[PDB]
Paper text:
P300 is an ∼2400AA multidomain protein whose catalytic core consists of bromo-, RING, PHD, and histone acetyltransferase (HAT) domains. By acetylating histones, p300 promotes gene expression. It can also acetylate itself, as well as other proteins, and recruit a larger complex of proteins including transcription factors. The overall structure is as expected from previous p300-HAT structures: a central β-sheet is composed of seven β-strands and surrounded by nine α-helices.
To improve homogeneity, a construct omitting the autoacetylation-prone autoinhibitory loop was inactivated through mutation of residue Y1467 to F: p300‐HAT‐YF‐Δloop [K1287‐Q1663/Y1467F/Δ(L1520‐L1580)] and overexpressed in E. coli. Blade-form ternary crystals of p300‐HAT‐YF‐Δloop with CoA and CPI-076 were obtained at 4° C from 200 + 150 nl microseeded sitting drops with a 60 μl reservoir consisting of 20% MPD, 0.1M Tris pH 8, and 7.5% PEG 5000 MME. Despite their chemical differences, these new allosteric compounds bind in the same location, ∼8 Å distant from the active site, between the α5 and α6 helices. So though these compounds are AcCoA modulated, there is obviously no direct competition for the AcCoA binding site. CPI-076 is secured in p300-HAT-CoA by hydrophobic interactions and a hydrogen bond with Asp1507 and also creates a water network out to Arg1392/Ile1486. With CPI-076's measured HAT-domain IC50 20 μM, SBDD efforts focused on driving the biochemical activity. CPI-076's structure offered 2 potential vectors for compound elaboration [Fig. 6(a)]. However, derivatization failed to improve the compound activity from this starting point (data not shown). The related compound CPI-076 had no measurable FL activity.
Author numbering: 1286 to 1517, 1582 to 1662
Amino acid sequence: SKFSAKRLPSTRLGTFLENRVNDFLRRQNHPESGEVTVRVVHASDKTVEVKPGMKARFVDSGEMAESFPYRTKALFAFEEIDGVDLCFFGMHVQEYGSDCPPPNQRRVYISYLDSVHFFRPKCLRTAVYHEILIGYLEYVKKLGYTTGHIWACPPSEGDDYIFHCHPPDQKIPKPKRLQEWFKKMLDKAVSERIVHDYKDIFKQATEDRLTSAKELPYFEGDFWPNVLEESIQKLYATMEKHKEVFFVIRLIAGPAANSLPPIVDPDPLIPCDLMDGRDAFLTLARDKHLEFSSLRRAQWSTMCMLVELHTQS
Ligand SMILES: CC(C)(COP(=O)(O)OP(=O)(O)OC[C@H]1O[C@@H](n2cnc3c(N)ncnc32)[C@H](O)[C@@H]1OP(=O)(O)O)[C@@H](O)C(=O)NCCC(=O)NCCS
Ligand SMILES: CC(=O)Nc1cccs1
């Protein structure tokens, strides 16, 4: 195909992730594995605005920035199966750099991740997802982001985070399973000296000696900004109750976290309105019936998705 995944423009981030995954695959040496291609298909500058209640309380008094700048990225992984691309993994992230005001400085937030379970061989699928995620943490660490933030909430039945119409026998993990799955990924990263340690949001706030909501990171679309608006101590109660779902991941700790030079992202902006957050691709897939429910349909949908990405106005 003149519209292959591999022909999508390369990025340092995508190159870094795909090389990590394919090196994992070379080590495993399984006869059914096919080459993985990771492409960043959207990167744009955004700002998240403090909502009214929090603004009135902390912004207007000069205690908190009014908004926080970030870059959003969308990336996708593809495996070559039978000389045909298959998109099997996607993620959108929010990256708050070194000039972003506290509390958000040098943090990354994983907005959404999703998958379609046709990776071959099946016995390496989870392992490959973990390699992608560990790579992403490794990469942002190298650039100088200090902390990663992951929300482990599975989609409710019939809801698709990124890919329209999942396979009917692709089970959706319960929250306990997904939380353990993230722990498994983070433990591997700990072993590899990528992650220093990780904590749920309640344990984090406690160890941080947080006493004011103005000190919690404030991300676009996250649970916490909405919780904070309703509130306007009871907050600490709500952090305890939902603590299992919210991982705070320390990449760089202690003194080496405060002497850092500015973060320099070597990758350019990538305008792609189709991939500016998850809604537009779901809308396109719903309208054009790009389903991901069987290997065959997913390959066809992948091919259509690729054509769109290559031919974007
Ligand atoms: C998160 C995700 C990528 C992990 O996929 P994965 O590595 O294959 O891990 P899962 O936990 O889904 O599946 C592993 C195994 O547990 C099984 N399993 C999953 N959910 C299950 C359930 N509710 N009951 C019983 N078994 C289940 C799977 O069938 C699979 O079994 P197998 O590999 O022996 O066939 C995938 O579940 C997914 O795309 N989920 C939807 C998106 C999402 O939850 N995003 C979360 C954070 S934004
Ligand atoms: C405020 C906060 O830490 N939000 C989080 C989002 C995801 C994991 S932790």
